[PDB]
Design a protein around this ligand. Structure first.
Ligand SMILES: CCOc1ccn(-c2ccc(F)cc2)c(=O)c1C(=O)Nc1ccc(Oc2ccnc(N)c2Cl)c(F)c1
Length: 278
């Protein structure tokens, strides 16, 4: 529309994908959810994922896209480009992730992860977060459902895009303010999700009052296959004082030590009480 904002229109220019150099297979759907949608696509012939807005809002869309342009790290999802379709909503083009999101992947009964594999995934998320934190970028919705998994089993932190209260730090639930320290709280929950193989956090608890629940003096239970030292790390991520939580560099350090101790002998099986739980 150009009448959007010169500055943004120019920034989107250096990453523009000519509508003729990308084919969208609207027939082959991938994502599809509240607001936007995801489709398979070909780029010139690289396989890709094409995010669209099903819909001011277009501006936030393009804006969220431009920020991704500086995300260059093996553990952070990259942007191929943004295609300005002269027929509909602009599109965001992403590399194809053969294994989809991390939560659905670990939840799969046909998969046979070990303690080591799962800790490894957490290690990769932490590396991605460490990069993001160094760029002063606050995620706000860090969870296993927002982490992608490619063909080499490399984890990419992302955001599919009504608060995810169950991953939110105490101060954020109380204030609505987000920081890197509240991302650490979310990361601890992400660790729990991995070790439980994608179980829903606080099954019994209502979204409307996780705050009251947490203030009673509670935290998530140690999953059955979670090593003590990793649980000790989870509890640190959930420190009541935000400044007392470890940084992502510390987490990378600590988790990488725990990970090195395993050899791939301990298989992780789903909990019977968590099965089919929504
Ligand atoms: C308009 C802004 O869009 C953003 C903006 C910022 N970040 C962002 C936020 C924080 C970070 F640390 C890094 C990136 C994003 O991740 C996205 C996004 O669209 N992500 C997204 C994710 C999965 C998708 O689905 C795929 C994709 C590939 N392969 C498969 N199989 C599937 Cl299922 C998908 F299509 C789109």
């Amino acid at each position: 529309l150009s009448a959007l904002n010169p500055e943004l229109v120019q920034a989107v220019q250096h990453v523009v994908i000519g509508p003729s150099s990308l084919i969208v297979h609207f027939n082959e759907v991938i994502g599809r959810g509240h607001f936007g949608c995801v489709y398979h696509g070909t780029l010139l012939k690289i396989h890709c994922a094409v995010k669209s807005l099903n819909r001011g809002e277009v501006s936030q869309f393009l804006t969220e896209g431009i920020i991704m342009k500086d995300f260059s790290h093996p553990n952070v999802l990259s942007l191929l480009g943004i295609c300005l379709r002269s027929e509909g909503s602009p599109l965001v083009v992403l590399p194809y992730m053969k294994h989809g999101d991390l939560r659905n992947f670990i939840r799969n009964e046909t998969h046979n992860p070990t303690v080591k594999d799962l800790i490894g995934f957490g290690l990769q998320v932490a590396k991605g977060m460490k990069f993001l934190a160094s760029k002063k970028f606050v995620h706000r919705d860090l969870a296993a459902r927002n982490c992608m998994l490619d063909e080499k089993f490399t984890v990419k932190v992302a955001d599919f895009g009504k608060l995810p209260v169950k991953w939110m730090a105490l101060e954020s639930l109380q204030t609505q303010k987000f920081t890197t320290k509240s991302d650490v709280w979310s990361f601890g929950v992400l660790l729990w999700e991995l070790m439980t193989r994608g179980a829903p956090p606080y099954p019994d608890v209502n979204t409307f009052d996780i705050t009251v629940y947490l203030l009673q003096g509670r935290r998530l239970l140690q999953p059955e296959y979670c090593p003590d030292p990793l649980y000790e790390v989870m509890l640190k991520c959930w420190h009541p004082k935000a400044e007392m939580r470890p940084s992502f560099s510390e987490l990378v350090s600590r988790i990488s030590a725990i990970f090195s101790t395993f050899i791939g002998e301990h298989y992780v099986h789903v909990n019977a009480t968590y099965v089919n739980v929504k």
